[model samples]
Target: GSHMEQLKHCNGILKELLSKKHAAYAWPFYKPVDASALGLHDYHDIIKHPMDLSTVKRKMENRDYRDAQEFAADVRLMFSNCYKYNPPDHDVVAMARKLQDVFEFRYAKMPD
Candidate 1:
Protein backbone atom coordinates (compact mmCIF):
# COMPACT_ATOMS: atom_id res chain seq x y z
CA GLY A 1 0.00 0.00 0.00
CA SER A 2 1.09 3.54 -0.66
CA HIS A 3 1.76 6.05 2.09
CA MET A 4 -1.58 7.82 1.68
CA GLU A 5 -3.73 4.70 1.84
CA GLN A 6 -1.75 3.24 4.69
CA LEU A 7 -2.05 6.39 6.78
CA LYS A 8 -5.74 6.69 6.04
CA HIS A 9 -6.18 3.02 6.81
CA CYS A 10 -4.61 3.46 10.24
CA ASN A 11 -6.70 6.55 10.90
CA GLY A 12 -9.83 4.73 9.78
CA ILE A 13 -9.45 2.40 12.74
CA LEU A 14 -9.26 5.45 14.99
CA LYS A 15 -12.40 6.87 13.43
CA GLU A 16 -14.19 3.57 13.92
CA LEU A 17 -13.26 3.71 17.58
CA LEU A 18 -14.31 7.34 17.91
CA SER A 19 -17.57 7.79 15.88
CA LYS A 20 -18.55 7.34 19.59
CA LYS A 21 -22.28 6.75 19.30
CA HIS A 22 -21.78 2.97 19.25
CA ALA A 23 -18.55 2.35 21.15
CA ALA A 24 -19.26 1.52 24.77
CA TYR A 25 -16.42 2.05 27.26
CA ALA A 26 -14.87 4.40 24.73
CA TRP A 27 -16.19 7.48 26.48
CA PRO A 28 -13.41 7.71 29.01
CA PHE A 29 -10.79 7.63 26.29
CA TYR A 30 -12.35 10.26 24.06
CA LYS A 31 -10.27 12.99 25.68
CA PRO A 32 -7.73 13.59 28.38
CA VAL A 33 -9.13 13.10 31.86
CA ASP A 34 -9.93 16.19 33.85
CA ALA A 35 -8.67 14.85 37.11
CA SER A 36 -9.22 18.03 39.10
CA ALA A 37 -12.85 18.82 38.38
CA LEU A 38 -13.81 15.18 38.63
CA GLY A 39 -12.09 14.97 42.06
CA LEU A 40 -9.67 12.35 40.83
CA HIS A 41 -6.84 14.11 42.62
CA ASP A 42 -4.80 10.96 42.71
CA TYR A 43 -5.29 10.07 39.09
CA HIS A 44 -2.37 12.06 37.74
CA ASP A 45 -0.23 10.94 40.63
CA ILE A 46 -0.67 7.26 39.88
CA ILE A 47 -0.32 7.51 36.11
CA LYS A 48 2.71 9.50 35.05
CA HIS A 49 1.63 9.71 31.43
CA PRO A 50 -1.89 10.00 30.15
CA MET A 51 -3.17 9.59 26.60
CA ASP A 52 -6.48 9.78 24.79
CA LEU A 53 -7.96 9.00 21.42
CA SER A 54 -8.61 12.65 20.68
CA THR A 55 -4.93 13.48 21.09
CA VAL A 56 -3.96 10.46 19.03
CA LYS A 57 -6.19 11.74 16.26
CA ARG A 58 -4.59 15.16 16.62
CA LYS A 59 -1.12 13.67 16.43
CA MET A 60 -2.16 11.66 13.41
CA GLU A 61 -3.32 14.79 11.63
CA ASN A 62 -0.38 16.86 12.83
CA ARG A 63 2.06 14.35 11.31
CA ASP A 64 3.42 13.76 14.79
CA TYR A 65 3.84 10.02 14.72
CA ARG A 66 7.04 8.84 13.08
CA ASP A 67 5.26 5.77 11.74
CA ALA A 68 2.61 3.18 12.40
CA GLN A 69 4.51 1.48 15.19
CA GLU A 70 4.90 4.72 17.09
CA PHE A 71 1.18 5.40 16.77
CA ALA A 72 0.48 1.85 17.96
CA ALA A 73 2.59 2.49 21.04
CA ASP A 74 0.49 5.52 21.98
CA VAL A 75 -2.72 3.57 21.67
CA ARG A 76 -1.26 0.82 23.81
CA LEU A 77 -0.20 3.37 26.41
CA MET A 78 -3.72 4.74 26.64
CA PHE A 79 -5.09 1.34 27.53
CA SER A 80 -2.22 0.57 29.83
CA ASN A 81 -2.93 3.76 31.79
CA CYS A 82 -6.51 2.68 32.18
CA TYR A 83 -5.43 -0.68 33.51
CA LYS A 84 -2.86 0.82 35.84
CA TYR A 85 -5.16 3.40 37.41
CA ASN A 86 -8.32 1.37 37.79
CA PRO A 87 -8.59 -1.45 40.29
CA PRO A 88 -8.05 -5.02 39.14
CA ASP A 89 -11.75 -5.84 39.43
CA HIS A 90 -13.01 -2.49 38.28
CA ASP A 91 -15.31 -2.37 35.28
CA VAL A 92 -13.04 -0.01 33.38
CA VAL A 93 -10.06 -2.30 33.87
CA ALA A 94 -11.97 -5.23 32.44
CA MET A 95 -13.10 -3.11 29.55
CA ALA A 96 -9.50 -2.08 28.90
CA ARG A 97 -8.47 -5.69 28.36
CA LYS A 98 -11.48 -6.51 26.22
CA LEU A 99 -11.12 -3.30 24.27
CA GLN A 100 -7.47 -4.04 23.47
CA ASP A 101 -8.52 -7.44 22.20
CA VAL A 102 -10.78 -5.84 19.62
CA PHE A 103 -8.24 -3.14 18.73
CA GLU A 104 -5.47 -5.66 18.15
CA PHE A 105 -7.77 -7.85 16.09
CA ARG A 106 -8.76 -5.08 13.73
CA TYR A 107 -5.27 -3.61 13.56
CA ALA A 108 -3.94 -6.96 12.39
CA LYS A 109 -6.68 -7.13 9.80
CA MET A 110 -5.43 -3.93 8.21
CA PRO A 111 -3.92 -4.43 4.75
CA ASP A 112 -0.18 -4.72 4.61
Candidate 2:
Protein backbone atom coordinates (compact mmCIF):
# COMPACT_ATOMS: atom_id res chain seq x y z
CA GLY A 1 0.00 0.00 0.00
CA SER A 2 1.05 3.56 -0.54
CA HIS A 3 1.75 5.29 2.75
CA MET A 4 -1.54 7.16 2.52
CA GLU A 5 -3.34 3.95 1.65
CA GLN A 6 -1.85 2.26 4.66
CA LEU A 7 -3.09 5.10 6.76
CA LYS A 8 -6.56 4.73 5.24
CA HIS A 9 -6.51 1.00 6.01
CA CYS A 10 -6.03 1.59 9.70
CA ASN A 11 -8.91 -0.16 11.42
CA GLY A 12 -9.58 1.88 14.52
CA ILE A 13 -8.76 4.94 16.56
CA LEU A 14 -4.97 4.85 16.60
CA LYS A 15 -4.54 7.63 19.10
CA GLU A 16 -6.29 10.29 21.07
CA LEU A 17 -4.26 13.41 21.61
CA LEU A 18 -5.41 15.50 24.49
CA SER A 19 -3.68 18.53 25.94
CA LYS A 20 -1.14 17.47 28.55
CA LYS A 21 -2.52 20.26 30.70
CA HIS A 22 -6.05 18.99 30.37
CA ALA A 23 -7.75 17.92 33.56
CA ALA A 24 -8.35 14.59 31.91
CA TYR A 25 -4.59 13.99 31.82
CA ALA A 26 -4.31 13.83 35.63
CA TRP A 27 -7.77 12.43 36.31
CA PRO A 28 -9.34 12.79 39.76
CA PHE A 29 -6.82 15.11 41.30
CA TYR A 30 -6.62 17.69 38.49
CA LYS A 31 -9.36 20.24 38.20
CA PRO A 32 -10.40 22.19 35.11
CA VAL A 33 -10.09 25.92 35.61
CA ASP A 34 -13.27 27.96 35.60
CA ALA A 35 -13.96 31.11 33.59
CA SER A 36 -13.49 33.46 36.53
CA ALA A 37 -10.00 32.25 37.33
CA LEU A 38 -8.69 31.96 33.80
CA GLY A 39 -9.85 35.44 32.76
CA LEU A 40 -9.88 34.32 29.14
CA HIS A 41 -11.49 30.89 29.10
CA ASP A 42 -13.84 31.80 26.27
CA TYR A 43 -10.99 31.66 23.76
CA HIS A 44 -9.97 28.19 24.91
CA ASP A 45 -12.20 26.40 27.35
CA ILE A 46 -9.49 24.04 28.56
CA ILE A 47 -6.99 26.50 30.00
CA LYS A 48 -4.50 25.12 32.50
CA HIS A 49 -3.48 27.25 35.47
CA PRO A 50 -1.21 25.13 37.56
CA MET A 51 -0.73 25.32 41.30
CA ASP A 52 2.80 24.16 40.70
CA LEU A 53 4.86 22.62 37.92
CA SER A 54 4.84 19.18 39.56
CA THR A 55 2.93 17.38 36.82
CA VAL A 56 5.23 18.66 34.10
CA LYS A 57 8.28 17.82 36.14
CA ARG A 58 7.17 14.25 36.76
CA LYS A 59 6.05 13.64 33.21
CA MET A 60 9.26 14.91 31.68
CA GLU A 61 11.81 13.98 34.33
CA ASN A 62 13.42 11.60 31.86
CA ARG A 63 13.51 14.17 29.09
CA ASP A 64 15.86 17.08 28.60
CA TYR A 65 15.17 20.26 30.54
CA ARG A 66 15.34 22.89 27.78
CA ASP A 67 12.81 21.28 25.47
CA ALA A 68 10.56 20.13 28.27
CA GLN A 69 10.26 23.53 29.89
CA GLU A 70 8.68 24.99 26.75
CA PHE A 71 5.85 22.51 26.92
CA ALA A 72 5.64 23.04 30.64
CA ALA A 73 5.28 26.79 30.23
CA ASP A 74 2.61 26.34 27.58
CA VAL A 75 0.56 24.27 29.99
CA ARG A 76 1.17 26.70 32.80
CA LEU A 77 0.16 29.70 30.73
CA MET A 78 -2.90 27.94 29.44
CA PHE A 79 -3.93 27.26 33.00
CA SER A 80 -3.07 30.75 34.08
CA ASN A 81 -5.54 32.12 31.55
CA CYS A 82 -8.05 29.29 31.75
CA TYR A 83 -10.40 31.10 34.01
CA LYS A 84 -10.97 33.95 31.57
CA TYR A 85 -13.96 33.99 29.23
CA ASN A 86 -13.52 35.54 25.82
CA PRO A 87 -15.43 33.74 23.12
CA PRO A 88 -14.25 34.48 19.62
CA ASP A 89 -16.10 37.31 18.08
CA HIS A 90 -17.37 37.01 14.50
CA ASP A 91 -14.25 38.66 13.11
CA VAL A 92 -12.07 36.51 15.36
CA VAL A 93 -13.81 33.35 14.24
CA ALA A 94 -12.97 34.19 10.66
CA MET A 95 -9.32 34.35 11.51
CA ALA A 96 -9.62 31.20 13.58
CA ARG A 97 -11.07 29.33 10.62
CA LYS A 98 -8.02 30.26 8.62
CA LEU A 99 -5.76 29.03 11.40
CA GLN A 100 -7.74 25.80 11.70
CA ASP A 101 -6.91 24.93 8.11
CA VAL A 102 -3.28 24.40 9.08
CA PHE A 103 -4.14 21.73 11.60
CA GLU A 104 -4.17 18.21 10.25
CA PHE A 105 -5.23 15.25 12.37
CA ARG A 106 -3.87 11.73 11.95
CA TYR A 107 -2.98 8.58 13.86
CA ALA A 108 -0.73 5.54 13.38
CA LYS A 109 -1.31 1.90 14.23
CA MET A 110 1.15 -0.85 15.00
CA PRO A 111 1.09 -4.24 16.67
CA ASP A 112 1.87 -4.28 20.34
Candidate 3:
Protein backbone atom coordinates (compact mmCIF):
# COMPACT_ATOMS: atom_id res chain seq x y z
CA GLY A 1 0.00 0.00 0.00
CA SER A 2 1.03 3.59 -0.43
CA HIS A 3 2.16 5.74 2.47
CA MET A 4 -1.15 7.55 2.62
CA GLU A 5 -3.02 4.28 2.55
CA GLN A 6 -0.95 2.89 5.42
CA LEU A 7 -1.43 6.06 7.37
CA LYS A 8 -5.15 5.82 6.93
CA HIS A 9 -5.05 2.26 8.17
CA CYS A 10 -3.05 3.36 11.19
CA ASN A 11 -5.46 6.18 11.85
CA GLY A 12 -8.42 3.84 11.79
CA ILE A 13 -6.74 1.61 14.35
CA LEU A 14 -5.87 4.58 16.53
CA LYS A 15 -9.47 5.70 16.52
CA GLU A 16 -10.63 2.51 18.17
CA LEU A 17 -7.98 2.85 20.85
CA LEU A 18 -8.76 6.49 21.48
CA SER A 19 -12.50 6.22 21.90
CA LYS A 20 -13.81 7.17 25.35
CA LYS A 21 -15.98 4.05 25.37
CA HIS A 22 -12.97 1.77 25.29
CA ALA A 23 -13.06 -0.96 27.96
CA ALA A 24 -9.96 0.25 29.75
CA TYR A 25 -9.77 3.47 31.75
CA ALA A 26 -8.08 5.26 28.88
CA TRP A 27 -8.73 8.74 30.26
CA PRO A 28 -5.21 9.41 31.47
CA PHE A 29 -3.62 8.40 28.18
CA TYR A 30 -5.77 10.88 26.31
CA LYS A 31 -3.92 13.98 27.46
CA PRO A 32 -0.77 15.11 29.22
CA VAL A 33 -0.71 14.82 32.98
CA ASP A 34 -1.57 17.77 35.18
CA ALA A 35 1.52 18.22 37.31
CA SER A 36 -0.27 20.20 40.00
CA ALA A 37 -3.37 18.00 40.08
CA LEU A 38 -1.35 14.82 40.32
CA GLY A 39 1.23 16.21 42.69
CA LEU A 40 3.85 15.44 40.09
CA HIS A 41 6.51 17.94 41.10
CA ASP A 42 9.14 15.83 39.40
CA TYR A 43 7.10 14.84 36.39
CA HIS A 44 9.18 17.01 34.13
CA ASP A 45 12.42 15.68 35.53
CA ILE A 46 11.31 12.06 35.65
CA ILE A 47 9.45 11.86 32.34
CA LYS A 48 11.87 14.19 30.53
CA HIS A 49 10.06 13.33 27.32
CA PRO A 50 6.29 13.13 27.57
CA MET A 51 3.79 11.90 25.04
CA ASP A 52 0.03 11.63 24.92
CA LEU A 53 -2.62 10.44 22.52
CA SER A 54 -3.74 14.01 21.93
CA THR A 55 -0.34 14.87 20.50
CA VAL A 56 -0.27 11.74 18.38
CA LYS A 57 -3.71 12.58 17.03
CA ARG A 58 -2.44 16.03 16.14
CA LYS A 59 0.58 14.55 14.44
CA MET A 60 -1.58 12.11 12.51
CA GLU A 61 -4.01 14.85 11.56
CA ASN A 62 -1.12 17.01 10.37
CA ARG A 63 0.63 14.10 8.63
CA ASP A 64 3.68 14.82 10.74
CA TYR A 65 4.92 11.26 10.84
CA ARG A 66 7.43 10.44 8.14
CA ASP A 67 6.23 6.85 8.03
CA ALA A 68 4.31 4.15 9.84
CA GLN A 69 7.13 3.46 12.28
CA GLU A 70 7.16 7.02 13.49
CA PHE A 71 3.46 6.79 14.22
CA ALA A 72 3.93 3.51 16.06
CA ALA A 73 6.82 4.88 18.09
CA ASP A 74 4.81 7.82 19.33
CA VAL A 75 2.07 5.53 20.63
CA ARG A 76 4.64 3.32 22.32
CA LEU A 77 6.46 6.31 23.75
CA MET A 78 3.28 7.56 25.41
CA PHE A 79 2.87 4.27 27.21
CA SER A 80 6.54 4.08 28.09
CA ASN A 81 6.39 7.52 29.63
CA CYS A 82 3.38 6.47 31.68
CA TYR A 83 5.41 3.57 33.06
CA LYS A 84 8.28 5.86 33.89
CA TYR A 85 6.20 8.37 35.81
CA ASN A 86 3.73 6.13 37.64
CA PRO A 87 4.08 3.23 40.04
CA PRO A 88 3.24 -0.27 38.78
CA ASP A 89 0.16 -0.51 40.98
CA HIS A 90 -1.21 2.86 40.03
CA ASP A 91 -4.45 2.90 38.03
CA VAL A 92 -2.86 5.01 35.35
CA VAL A 93 -0.09 2.50 34.96
CA ALA A 94 -2.60 -0.32 34.76
CA MET A 95 -4.53 1.55 32.14
CA ALA A 96 -1.31 2.19 30.25
CA ARG A 97 -0.53 -1.52 30.25
CA LYS A 98 -3.93 -2.52 28.94
CA LEU A 99 -4.08 0.30 26.45
CA GLN A 100 -0.64 -0.46 25.08
CA ASP A 101 -1.52 -4.13 24.77
CA VAL A 102 -4.58 -3.18 22.77
CA PHE A 103 -2.51 -0.76 20.72
CA GLU A 104 0.12 -3.37 19.82
CA PHE A 105 -2.51 -5.91 18.86
CA ARG A 106 -4.35 -3.43 16.69
CA TYR A 107 -1.20 -1.97 15.18
CA ALA A 108 0.18 -5.36 14.25
CA LYS A 109 -3.03 -6.20 12.51
CA MET A 110 -3.13 -2.87 10.66
CA PRO A 111 -3.35 -3.42 6.93
CA ASP A 112 -0.53 -2.55 4.60
Q: Order the candidate numbers by lDDT, best to worst.
A: 3, 1, 2
Residues 1-112, candidate 2: write the lDDT tens digits: 3233333222121112123433333332233433467464453434334432344334445432343234434443533342232245544344323322221122223222
lDDT preference between candidates 2 and 3, better one: 3
Whole-model Cα lDDT of every candidate shown, in order:
0.82, 0.33, 0.82
Given candidate 1, what's the lDDT at residue 11?
90
In terms of TM-score, how similar is model 3 to the real structure?
0.90
The residue ranges of model 3 lying beyond 4 angstroms of the native Cα positions read: none
TM-score, each model? 0.87, 0.22, 0.90
Runs off by more than 4 Å, candidate 1:
1-4
| Runs with alpha carbons beyond 4 Å of true place in candidate 2 | 1-52, 64-72, 75-79, 82-112
Candidate 1: residue 25 Cα off by (Å): 1.7
Q: Write the per-residue lDDT of candidate 3 for residues 29-94, one digit (tens) a residue.
A: 788878879788898988877888888999888979877888898898898988887788988888
